[PDB]
């Protein structure tokens, strides 16, 4: 049935800001809320006329959320659902989770709960937050604990922004990532990682943007994120309830992390070119250069596959397409599965923000796969993290907010265990 989005902290807020705009464009909802079940899974018909999103926006500084209540979409949300906390998290999980976090978590949880109240069968939450950075890692962690206390069964899907050096602020990023990913783990259900490097790299090879914005990256993410929710926003074939959606992707309580690969990313201005075949875009999905966590899956193994087509498409094609993906490519499925490919088709074509960078496309794909190759992004972090921590590099900033030194030890102890898990799902 229902579905609450929670956006925590700048990255999360701005990613959100940029797909609620896309949801609005998809469902014909004008910025003022008015539009002349279904998409009801995400919007609540409040009063007579309006269509407010089932969302809460939380940041610990004003600034970002403040920009939301300033420029159109200003009237989209309700004033309350946008929460801001005066002082920063200053780029450290400890501050975020404990020190400044403490103060605002009672207001957030108590407000989320007001949305929960207006849901005749609330289904789960969609949390959007950065991996690096302060409130993104810190406050999210604490939210997710207390959420797991306040909403038992109710699923929790997360959209994590995995940090990449070029478009990044803090040096202590790795600590924050490893710190949260640990605390958060036994509280998430399935988690979609987004490698900022990949999203930036796609914008450079594909859109030809010399050096992309955050709003450049964001619009792309918005699309990948829409493509995922899509299934349960209109009513489209399978992946058709939050349990059943992921009952598909995750074979083991840990191993949350599906790899997202989005179909035709083709720069507006090229719009009037020849439209790409259902076979050609399917093939795009099995090309690392098109991925979304920079890794390499003709290396690890697949334990789940899941093509999610959007736009006008017939199964006769998707089937006949899948055939030649197997022939002239790397099948590479682990020991103890089928050779899956759950196919979902959503006839409602992809929309694009009209002033944006990418063109209107006829047909898109989304290929979500639980591959052991993602583990690579778990090392590239752990390596950084070890190599600083080996010297206590910035640890004293955390101990300073009253965090135990052994809480670093222990989170890294888990990231090892995970890296172990992921490698131990090969061969039998």
């Amino acid at each position: 049935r229902e579905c609450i989005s929670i956006h925590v902290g700048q990255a999360g807020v701005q990613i959100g800001n940029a797909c609620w705009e896309l949801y609005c464009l998809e469902h014909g909802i004008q910025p003022d809320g008015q539009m002349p079940d279904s998409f009801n899974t995400f919007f609540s018909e409040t009063g007579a006329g309006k269509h407010v999103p089932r969302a809460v926006f939380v940041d610990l500084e004003p600034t970002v959320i403040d920009e939301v209540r300033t420029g159109t979409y200003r009237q989209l949300f309700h004033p309350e659902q946008l929460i801001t906390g005066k002082e920063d998290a200053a780029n450290n999980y400890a501050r975020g989770h404990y020190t400044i976090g403490k103060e605002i978590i009672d207001l957030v949880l108590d407000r989320i709960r007001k949305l929960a109240d207006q849901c005749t069968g609330l289904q789960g939450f969609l949390v959007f937050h950065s991996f690096g950075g302060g409130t993104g890692s810190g406050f999210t962690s604490l939210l997710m604990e207390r959420l797991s206390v306040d909403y038992g069964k109710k699923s929790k899907l997360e959209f994590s922004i995995y940090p990449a050096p070029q478009v990044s602020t803090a040096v202590v990023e790795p600590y924050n990532s490893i710190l949260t990913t640990h605390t958060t783990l036994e509280h998430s259900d399935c988690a979609f990682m987004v490698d900022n490097e990949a999203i930036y790299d796609i914008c450079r090879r594909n859109l030809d943007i010399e050096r992309p914005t955050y709003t450049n990256l964001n619009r792309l993410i918005g699309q990948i994120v829409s493509s995922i929710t899509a299934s349960l926003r209109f009513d489209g074939a399978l992946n058709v309830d939050l349990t059943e959606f992921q009952t598909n992707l995750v074979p083991y309580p840990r191993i949350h992390f599906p790899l997202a690969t989005y179909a035709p990313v083709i720069s507006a201005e090229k719009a009037y070119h020849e439209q790409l075949s259902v076979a050609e875009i399917t093939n795009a999905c099995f090309e690392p250069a098109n991925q979304m966590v920079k890794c390499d899956p003709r290396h690890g193994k697949y334990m789940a596959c899941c093509l999610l087509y959007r736009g006008d498409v017939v199964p006769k094609d998707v089937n006949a397409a899948i055939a030649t993906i197997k022939t002239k490519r790397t099948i590479q499925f682990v020991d103890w599965c089928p050779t899956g490919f759950k196919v979902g088709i959503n006839y409602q074509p992809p929309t694009v923000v009209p002033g944006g960078d990418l063109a209107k496309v006829q047909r898109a794909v989304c290929m979500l796969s639980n591959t052991t190759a993602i583990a690579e992004a778990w090392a590239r972090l752990d390596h950084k993290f070890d190599l600083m921590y080996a010297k206590r590099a910035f640890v004293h900033w955390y101990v300073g907010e009253g965090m135990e030194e052994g809480e670093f030890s222990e989170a890294r102890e888990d990231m090892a265990a995970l890296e172990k898990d992921y490698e131990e799902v090969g061969v039998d």
């Binding site: 349990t243 009952t247 074979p251 083991y252 789940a304 017939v314 103890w336 599965c337 039998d428």
Partner: protein, 420 residues
């Protein structure tokens, strides 16, 4: 003498509704009302399937169960939707889950009573109640899961009466859940324990039939549900027509099931899509024309029941039948003597001037179980998606208990490719 119809879960209801609107045209019933058609026979055994209500009106004896509204409102706002009595529907509201455990334990046992409550006031309203037939998918959750519990709860309220199931044993090709083998194995266990007959309908078979031999490019659940509805109306005829041989549901059971466990009938049909007698018989007795994916070559027949349809000179019919089981003499088991009975009923199905259908209790069925079981041990081996069930309250070794129970069933079907 009078059977009620439980029809539970998405695949169950989709099959069920098409089945109903097929027999209501055979019998000649309006969307709401009753008789309109120049035939006379029909109404004699309409007793069996239609508890008839006030005025003229016929209303099918049906319980419609689901664990969420969606696919039920589908049926109401559709074909012969206005036909079933209002509070004979049972909405689940909650998650179905595509998770056996949910349908059999948690979210299921939630409903269960409200269902039984209607199966009671329908059944406790029969002159002499024959028994129940349920239709449902075997993979997935609301049908496969609550259903097996429903039947587990019916035998107990009616040990007494016999138990029927059209069950759709599921396939990798045309399917929508990695977990289906888990859901299926869990049910196949239950079925073995609580039914008297089960008609095994392979979605694998069906698909093949449309694309192996029908030129149908993209098989919907549409032009594939169609085959089942036709198969189901054939299989029943004698329960609902002139009726001397078989036709009595227990009589069918006493005749089709040698051994308490082996009640897995694989069905088969005449011509197809949406014919001479010999050709009709060579088709209805064909691998390429069975409703379960398994060639009845690798495996013999314990009993066959075949039922022909249409004004046709049956001098040729027994003649034909007799030949089949001489031509192909070796594949009918020697130790059960007159083990393949035939009957004829002269009222054709939709379109078709001539038709036939065949129920076979065949050890070729072994072939199907093995394949759903090879899928299952393939996952449970290093314990795949099991955590979805562990969490719903289930026990680790209960999966090991079902597998093992069903592995026996393979080992029995095998056992009875025996000797005189």
């Amino acid at each position: 003498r009078e059977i009620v119809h439980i029809q539970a879960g998405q695949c169950g209801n989709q099959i069920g509704a098409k089945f109903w609107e097929v027999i209501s045209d055979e019998h000649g019933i309006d969307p709401t009302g009753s008789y309109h058609g120049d035939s006379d026979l029909q109404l004699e055994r309409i007793n069996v399937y239609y508890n008839e209500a006030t005025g003229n009106k016929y209303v099918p004896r049906a319980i419609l169960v689901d664990l969420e509204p969606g696919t039920m409102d589908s049926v109401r706002s559709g074909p012969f939707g206005q036909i079933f009595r209002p509070d004979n529907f049972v909405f689940g509201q909650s998650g179905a889950g595509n998770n056996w455990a949910k349908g059999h334990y948690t979210e299921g046992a939630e409903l269960v009573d409200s269902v039984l409550d209607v199966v009671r006031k329908e059944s406790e309203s029969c002159d002499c109640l024959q028994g129940f037939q349920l239709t449902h998918s075997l993979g997935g959750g609301t049908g496969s899961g609550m259903g097996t519990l429903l039947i587990s709860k019916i035998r107990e309220e009616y040990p007494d009466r016999i138990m029927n199931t059209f069950s759709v044993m599921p396939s990798p090709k045309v399917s929508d859940t990695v977990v289906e083998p888990y859901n299926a194995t869990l049910s196949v266990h239950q079925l073995v324990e609580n039914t008297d007959e089960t008609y095994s309908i392979d979605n694998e078979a069906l698909y093949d039939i449309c694309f192996r031999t029908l030129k149908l490019t993209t098989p919907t659940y549409g032009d594939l549900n169609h085959l089942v509805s036709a198969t189901m109306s054939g299989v029943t005829t004698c329960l609902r027509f002139p009726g001397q041989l078989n036709a009595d549901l227990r009589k069918l059971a006493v005749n089709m099931v040698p051994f308490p466990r082996l009640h897995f009938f694989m069905p088969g049909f005449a011509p197809l899509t949406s014919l001479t007698v010999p050709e009709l018989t060579q088709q209805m007795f064909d691998s390429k024309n069975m409703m379960a994916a398994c060639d009845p070559r690798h495996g013999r027949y314990l009993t066959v029941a075949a039922v022909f349809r249409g004004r046709m000179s049956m001098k040729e019919v027994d003649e034909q039948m007799l030949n089949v089981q001489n031509k192909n003499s070796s594949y009918f088991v020697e130790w059960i003597p007159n083990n393949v009975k035939t009957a004829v009923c002269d009222i054709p199905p939709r379109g078709l001037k001539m038709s036939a259908t065949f129920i076979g209790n065949s050890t070729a069925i072994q072939e199907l179980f093995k394949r759903i079981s090879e899928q299952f041990t393939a996952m449970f081996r290093r314990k795949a998606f099991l955590h979805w069930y562990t969490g719903e309250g289930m026990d680790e070794m209960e999966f090991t208990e079902a597998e093992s129970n069903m592995n026996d069933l393979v080992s029995e079907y095998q056992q009875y490719q025996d000797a005189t």
